[PDB]
Amino acid sequence: ETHINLKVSDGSSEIFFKIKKTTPLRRLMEAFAKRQGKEMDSLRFLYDGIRIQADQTPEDLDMEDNDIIEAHREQIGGLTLAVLLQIAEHWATRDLRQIEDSKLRALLTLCAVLTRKFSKSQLGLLCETHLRHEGLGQDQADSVLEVYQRLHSDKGGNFEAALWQQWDRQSLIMFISAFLNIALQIPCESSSVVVSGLATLYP
Amino acid sequence: GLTLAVLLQIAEHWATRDLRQIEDSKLRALLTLCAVLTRKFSKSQLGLLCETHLRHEGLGQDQADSVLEVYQRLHSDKGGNFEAALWQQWDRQSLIMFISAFLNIALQIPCESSSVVVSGLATLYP
Protein backbone atom coordinates (compact mmCIF):
# COMPACT_ATOMS: atom_id res chain seq x y z
CA GLU A 1 0.00 0.00 0.00
CA THR A 2 1.46 3.35 -1.05
CA HIS A 3 -1.58 5.19 0.39
CA ILE A 4 -2.90 5.55 3.93
CA ASN A 5 -6.26 6.60 5.34
CA LEU A 6 -6.14 9.02 8.25
CA LYS A 7 -8.74 10.84 10.32
CA VAL A 8 -8.15 14.37 11.66
CA SER A 9 -10.46 15.29 14.58
CA ASP A 10 -10.76 18.07 17.15
CA GLY A 11 -13.44 16.20 19.17
CA SER A 12 -16.38 17.88 17.35
CA SER A 13 -15.48 18.09 13.67
CA GLU A 14 -13.83 15.04 12.15
CA ILE A 15 -12.54 14.51 8.62
CA PHE A 16 -11.62 11.29 6.88
CA PHE A 17 -8.66 11.71 4.56
CA LYS A 18 -6.56 9.64 2.19
CA ILE A 19 -3.01 10.48 1.25
CA LYS A 20 0.19 8.95 -0.08
CA LYS A 21 2.66 7.82 2.61
CA THR A 22 5.58 9.94 1.29
CA THR A 23 3.42 13.13 1.09
CA PRO A 24 3.88 15.74 3.89
CA LEU A 25 0.95 16.12 6.25
CA ARG A 26 0.72 19.88 5.49
CA ARG A 27 -2.13 19.52 2.99
CA LEU A 28 -4.28 17.60 5.45
CA MET A 29 -3.53 20.14 8.15
CA GLU A 30 -4.43 22.97 5.76
CA ALA A 31 -7.68 21.30 4.66
CA PHE A 32 -8.77 20.71 8.27
CA ALA A 33 -8.04 24.27 9.37
CA LYS A 34 -9.83 25.54 6.23
CA ARG A 35 -12.98 23.58 7.22
CA GLN A 36 -13.01 25.15 10.70
CA GLY A 37 -12.53 28.50 8.92
CA LYS A 38 -9.14 28.83 10.63
CA GLU A 39 -5.53 29.43 9.70
CA MET A 40 -3.30 26.35 10.00
CA ASP A 41 -1.16 28.20 12.59
CA SER A 42 -4.18 28.65 14.94
CA LEU A 43 -4.10 24.86 15.34
CA ARG A 44 -1.60 22.22 16.40
CA PHE A 45 -1.70 18.58 15.39
CA LEU A 46 -0.75 15.63 17.59
CA TYR A 47 -0.10 11.99 16.81
CA ASP A 48 0.27 9.57 19.72
CA GLY A 49 0.22 12.55 22.11
CA ILE A 50 3.09 14.28 20.29
CA ARG A 51 3.04 17.47 18.31
CA ILE A 52 3.88 16.88 14.68
CA GLN A 53 5.01 19.27 12.00
CA ALA A 54 3.63 20.08 8.54
CA ASP A 55 6.73 18.80 6.68
CA GLN A 56 6.59 15.29 8.22
CA THR A 57 5.14 12.32 6.35
CA PRO A 58 3.02 9.37 7.47
CA GLU A 59 6.02 7.28 6.46
CA ASP A 60 8.50 9.17 8.69
CA LEU A 61 6.01 8.78 11.56
CA ASP A 62 5.18 5.04 11.09
CA MET A 63 1.48 5.78 10.84
CA GLU A 64 -0.91 2.91 10.27
CA ASP A 65 -3.98 2.77 8.09
CA ASN A 66 -6.95 4.50 9.79
CA ASP A 67 -4.88 6.18 12.46
CA ILE A 68 -6.09 9.41 14.06
CA ILE A 69 -4.47 12.83 14.20
CA GLU A 70 -5.78 15.18 16.91
CA ALA A 71 -6.32 18.89 16.12
CA HIS A 72 -5.88 21.18 19.13
CA ARG A 73 -6.48 24.94 19.31
CA GLU A 74 -3.26 26.88 20.03
CA GLN A 75 -2.98 28.32 23.52
CA ILE A 76 -1.59 31.82 22.74
CA GLY A 77 -0.03 33.48 25.83
CA GLY A 78 -0.78 32.39 29.41
CA LEU A 79 -3.19 35.04 30.66
CA THR A 80 -5.26 33.11 33.20
CA LEU A 81 -7.47 35.24 35.50
CA ALA A 82 -5.01 34.30 38.29
CA VAL A 83 -2.17 35.86 36.30
CA LEU A 84 -4.20 39.02 35.49
CA LEU A 85 -4.97 39.54 39.16
CA GLN A 86 -1.20 39.23 39.98
CA ILE A 87 -0.46 41.91 37.41
CA ALA A 88 -3.23 44.15 38.80
CA GLU A 89 -2.01 43.70 42.39
CA HIS A 90 1.58 44.50 41.39
CA TRP A 91 0.66 47.69 39.57
CA ALA A 92 -2.00 48.87 41.99
CA THR A 93 0.60 50.31 44.39
CA ARG A 94 2.81 51.92 41.71
CA ASP A 95 3.36 55.58 40.84
CA LEU A 96 2.61 55.60 37.13
CA ARG A 97 4.01 59.06 36.29
CA GLN A 98 7.28 57.18 35.90
CA ILE A 99 6.41 54.53 33.31
CA GLU A 100 6.82 54.38 29.51
CA ASP A 101 3.80 55.00 27.30
CA SER A 102 4.00 51.37 26.14
CA LYS A 103 3.41 50.11 29.74
CA LEU A 104 0.64 52.67 30.31
CA ARG A 105 -1.10 51.54 27.13
CA ALA A 106 -0.92 47.94 28.34
CA LEU A 107 -2.30 48.96 31.76
CA LEU A 108 -5.25 50.61 29.94
CA THR A 109 -5.89 47.21 28.32
CA LEU A 110 -5.64 45.53 31.72
CA CYS A 111 -8.36 47.85 33.08
CA ALA A 112 -10.63 47.13 30.09
CA VAL A 113 -10.13 43.35 30.34
CA LEU A 114 -10.66 43.32 34.09
CA THR A 115 -13.74 45.56 33.85
CA ARG A 116 -15.31 42.82 31.69
CA LYS A 117 -14.85 40.31 34.48
CA PHE A 118 -17.53 42.14 36.54
CA SER A 119 -21.20 41.36 36.02
CA LYS A 120 -23.11 44.27 34.47
CA SER A 121 -25.02 44.61 37.74
CA GLN A 122 -21.80 45.63 39.57
CA LEU A 123 -20.88 48.54 37.28
CA GLY A 124 -22.89 50.92 39.52
CA LEU A 125 -20.92 49.90 42.64
CA LEU A 126 -17.67 50.06 40.68
CA CYS A 127 -18.56 53.63 39.63
CA GLU A 128 -19.58 54.67 43.17
CA THR A 129 -16.40 53.12 44.68
CA HIS A 130 -14.33 54.90 42.02
CA LEU A 131 -15.83 58.23 42.97
CA ARG A 132 -15.18 57.67 46.70
CA HIS A 133 -11.59 56.52 46.03
CA GLU A 134 -10.78 59.67 44.07
CA GLY A 135 -12.88 62.07 46.19
CA LEU A 136 -15.01 63.04 43.20
CA GLY A 137 -18.74 63.76 43.74
CA GLN A 138 -22.11 62.84 42.18
CA ASP A 139 -21.25 65.53 39.61
CA GLN A 140 -18.99 62.95 37.91
CA ALA A 141 -21.13 59.78 38.33
CA ASP A 142 -22.52 59.68 34.80
CA SER A 143 -19.13 60.25 33.18
CA VAL A 144 -17.42 57.51 35.24
CA LEU A 145 -20.22 54.99 34.73
CA GLU A 146 -20.16 55.70 30.98
CA VAL A 147 -16.44 54.90 30.82
CA TYR A 148 -16.93 51.58 32.64
CA GLN A 149 -20.10 50.68 30.77
CA ARG A 150 -18.42 51.43 27.42
CA LEU A 151 -15.35 49.39 28.35
CA HIS A 152 -17.55 46.59 29.56
CA SER A 153 -19.27 46.44 26.15
CA ASP A 154 -16.17 47.38 24.07
CA LYS A 155 -16.17 44.46 21.65
CA GLY A 156 -13.91 45.95 18.96
CA GLY A 157 -11.38 47.57 21.28
CA ASN A 158 -12.52 50.83 19.64
CA PHE A 159 -13.56 52.72 22.76
CA GLU A 160 -10.31 51.77 24.53
CA ALA A 161 -8.37 53.15 21.51
CA ALA A 162 -10.37 56.40 21.51
CA LEU A 163 -9.67 56.82 25.24
CA TRP A 164 -5.94 56.48 24.56
CA GLN A 165 -5.98 59.10 21.76
CA GLN A 166 -8.42 61.57 23.44
CA TRP A 167 -7.48 61.54 27.17
CA ASP A 168 -4.41 63.34 28.44
CA ARG A 169 -1.79 61.31 30.30
CA GLN A 170 -2.65 62.60 33.80
CA SER A 171 -6.30 61.59 33.23
CA LEU A 172 -5.41 58.10 32.07
CA ILE A 173 -3.08 57.64 35.02
CA MET A 174 -5.67 58.80 37.53
CA PHE A 175 -8.33 56.42 36.13
CA ILE A 176 -6.12 53.33 35.73
CA SER A 177 -4.73 53.72 39.20
CA ALA A 178 -8.19 54.26 40.70
CA PHE A 179 -9.49 51.12 38.96
CA LEU A 180 -6.60 48.81 39.90
CA ASN A 181 -7.15 49.66 43.56
CA ILE A 182 -10.98 49.31 43.74
CA ALA A 183 -11.29 46.30 41.39
CA LEU A 184 -9.48 43.84 43.67
CA GLN A 185 -11.76 44.70 46.65
CA ILE A 186 -15.22 44.73 45.04
CA PRO A 187 -17.32 41.58 44.57
CA CYS A 188 -17.56 40.49 40.90
CA GLU A 189 -21.25 39.48 41.16
CA SER A 190 -24.24 41.15 42.84
CA SER A 191 -26.07 39.76 45.82
CA SER A 192 -28.69 37.11 45.44
CA VAL A 193 -29.85 33.94 47.09
CA VAL A 194 -27.91 32.02 44.45
CA VAL A 195 -24.70 33.94 45.07
CA SER A 196 -25.19 33.56 48.87
CA GLY A 197 -25.11 29.83 48.05
CA LEU A 198 -21.43 30.24 47.23
CA ALA A 199 -20.77 31.09 50.92
CA THR A 200 -21.29 27.40 51.73
CA LEU A 201 -18.30 26.57 49.46
CA TYR A 202 -15.72 28.81 51.23
CA PRO A 203 -12.89 26.71 52.87
CA GLY B 1 -17.16 39.45 49.47
CA LEU B 2 -17.06 37.33 46.30
CA THR B 3 -14.06 39.13 44.81
CA LEU B 4 -12.25 37.84 41.74
CA ALA B 5 -9.49 36.51 44.08
CA VAL B 6 -12.01 34.76 46.33
CA LEU B 7 -13.76 33.20 43.36
CA LEU B 8 -10.46 31.64 42.24
CA GLN B 9 -9.63 30.43 45.81
CA ILE B 10 -12.98 28.60 45.94
CA ALA B 11 -12.45 27.08 42.50
CA GLU B 12 -8.87 25.99 43.36
CA HIS B 13 -10.02 24.28 46.53
CA TRP B 14 -12.94 22.47 44.83
CA ALA B 15 -11.00 21.26 41.79
CA THR B 16 -9.13 18.98 44.23
CA ARG B 17 -12.29 17.62 46.03
CA ASP B 18 -13.83 14.17 45.63
CA LEU B 19 -17.52 14.68 44.84
CA ARG B 20 -18.67 11.05 45.54
CA GLN B 21 -20.88 12.16 48.46
CA ILE B 22 -21.58 15.76 47.45
CA GLU B 23 -24.78 17.11 49.06
CA ASP B 24 -27.45 18.55 46.71
CA SER B 25 -27.13 22.06 48.15
CA LYS B 26 -23.37 22.01 47.65
CA LEU B 27 -23.75 20.66 44.15
CA ARG B 28 -26.24 23.46 43.38
CA ALA B 29 -23.67 25.98 44.59
CA LEU B 30 -20.88 24.35 42.55
CA LEU B 31 -23.11 24.83 39.51
CA THR B 32 -23.27 28.54 40.34
CA LEU B 33 -19.50 28.65 40.77
CA CYS B 34 -18.94 27.09 37.38
CA ALA B 35 -21.46 29.46 35.73
CA VAL B 36 -19.82 32.51 37.27
CA LEU B 37 -16.29 31.37 36.34
CA THR B 38 -17.34 30.46 32.77
CA ARG B 39 -18.35 34.10 32.39
CA LYS B 40 -14.79 35.22 33.30
CA PHE B 41 -13.60 33.77 29.98
CA SER B 42 -13.95 35.87 26.82
CA LYS B 43 -16.36 34.43 24.23
CA SER B 44 -13.40 33.58 21.98
CA GLN B 45 -12.15 31.05 24.66
CA LEU B 46 -15.33 28.92 24.75
CA GLY B 47 -14.20 26.72 21.90
CA LEU B 48 -10.92 25.94 23.71
CA LEU B 49 -12.78 25.18 26.96
CA CYS B 50 -15.21 22.81 25.27
CA GLU B 51 -12.37 21.14 23.34
CA THR B 52 -10.34 20.61 26.51
CA HIS B 53 -13.41 19.33 28.36
CA LEU B 54 -14.29 16.80 25.63
CA ARG B 55 -10.75 15.43 25.67
CA HIS B 56 -10.42 15.37 29.47
CA GLU B 57 -13.61 13.33 29.74
CA GLY B 58 -13.23 10.99 26.71
CA LEU B 59 -16.52 12.34 25.34
CA GLY B 60 -17.48 11.43 21.81
CA GLN B 61 -18.34 13.63 18.89
CA ASP B 62 -21.95 12.66 19.53
CA GLN B 63 -21.81 14.73 22.77
CA ALA B 64 -19.86 17.75 21.37
CA ASP B 65 -22.73 20.01 20.48
CA SER B 66 -24.22 19.38 23.88
CA VAL B 67 -21.16 20.32 25.99
CA LEU B 68 -20.55 23.37 23.82
CA GLU B 69 -24.17 24.48 24.20
CA VAL B 70 -23.90 24.32 27.99
CA TYR B 71 -20.74 26.44 27.87
CA GLN B 72 -22.31 28.99 25.49
CA ARG B 73 -25.51 29.23 27.54
CA LEU B 74 -23.76 29.56 30.88
CA HIS B 75 -21.58 32.23 29.28
CA SER B 76 -24.55 34.17 27.87
CA ASP B 77 -26.75 33.56 30.93
CA LYS B 78 -28.80 36.34 32.57
CA GLY B 79 -30.40 36.16 36.06
CA GLY B 80 -29.51 32.49 36.54
CA ASN B 81 -32.13 31.49 33.92
CA PHE B 82 -30.28 28.77 32.00
CA GLU B 83 -28.40 27.63 35.10
CA ALA B 84 -31.69 26.99 36.91
CA ALA B 85 -33.00 25.04 33.89
CA LEU B 86 -29.85 22.88 33.80
CA TRP B 87 -30.27 22.08 37.49
CA GLN B 88 -33.84 20.90 36.83
CA GLN B 89 -33.17 19.04 33.59
CA TRP B 90 -29.86 17.26 34.11
CA ASP B 91 -29.45 14.12 36.16
CA ARG B 92 -27.12 14.32 39.19
CA GLN B 93 -24.25 12.23 37.75
CA SER B 94 -24.13 14.35 34.57
CA LEU B 95 -23.92 17.60 36.54
CA ILE B 96 -21.19 16.28 38.89
CA MET B 97 -19.12 15.08 35.95
CA PHE B 98 -19.46 18.36 34.11
CA ILE B 99 -18.63 20.42 37.21
CA SER B 100 -15.66 18.20 38.14
CA ALA B 101 -14.22 18.34 34.59
CA PHE B 102 -14.71 22.13 34.36
CA LEU B 103 -12.88 22.79 37.63
CA ASN B 104 -10.01 20.53 36.61
CA ILE B 105 -9.45 22.20 33.21
CA ALA B 106 -10.63 25.84 33.60
CA LEU B 107 -7.85 27.02 35.93
CA GLN B 108 -5.02 26.44 33.39
CA ILE B 109 -6.78 27.99 30.39
CA PRO B 110 -6.18 31.68 29.54
CA CYS B 111 -9.23 33.83 30.14
CA GLU B 112 -8.35 36.05 27.09
CA SER B 113 -6.89 35.14 23.65
CA SER B 114 -6.77 38.36 21.52
CA SER B 115 -3.36 38.97 19.86
CA VAL B 116 -3.87 42.67 20.70
CA VAL B 117 -4.43 41.71 24.37
CA VAL B 118 -1.66 39.10 24.87
CA SER B 119 0.91 41.31 23.08
CA GLY B 120 0.10 44.31 25.30
CA LEU B 121 -0.07 42.54 28.64
CA ALA B 122 3.25 40.69 28.16
CA THR B 123 5.12 43.90 29.04
CA LEU B 124 3.38 44.10 32.47
CA TYR B 125 4.49 40.82 34.08
CA PRO B 126 6.89 41.45 37.05
Curated annotation (Swiss-Prot), chain A:
**What residue spans carry the region label Interaction with the nucleoprotein?**
117-134
Q: What does this protein do?
A: Multifunctional protein that acts as a viral transcriptional activator. Promotes read-through of an RNA hairpin in the NP open reading frame to enhance viral transcription. Mechanistically, nonphosphorylated VP30 hexamers form a ternary complex with the viral leader RNA. Clamps the RNA template and the complex VP35-polymerase L together, thereby increasing the polymerase affinity for the RNA template to increase transcription initiation despite the presence of RNA secondary structures. Also assists stop-start transcription at gene junctions to promote transcription of downstream genes.
Where in the cell? Answer: Virion; Host cytoplasm
Q: What name does this protein carry? A: Transcriptional activator VP30
The family this protein is said to belong to: Belongs to the filoviridae transcriptional activator VP30 family.
Write down the species. Answer: Reston ebolavirus (strain Reston-89) (REBOV)
Whom does it interact with, and what assembly results? Answer: Homohexamer; hexamerization is essential for RNA binding. Interacts with the nucleoprotein/NP; this interaction plays both essential and inhibitory roles in viral RNA synthesis. Interacts with VP35. Interacts with host STAU1. Interacts (via C-terminus) with host RBBP6 isoform 1. Interacts with host DICER1; this interaction prevents TARBP2/TRBP binding to DICER1 and thus allows the virus to counteract host RNA silencing.
Q: Which domain of life is it from?
A: Viruses
Which cysteines are cross-linked by disulfides?
none
Gene for this chain: VP30
Record PTM: Phosphorylated by host. Phosphorylation negatively regulates the transcription activation. Phosphorylation and dephosphorylation take place in viral inclusion bodies and are largely influenced by the presence of NP. Dephosphorylated by host PPP2R5C; this dephosphorylation enhances viral transcription and is mediated by NP.
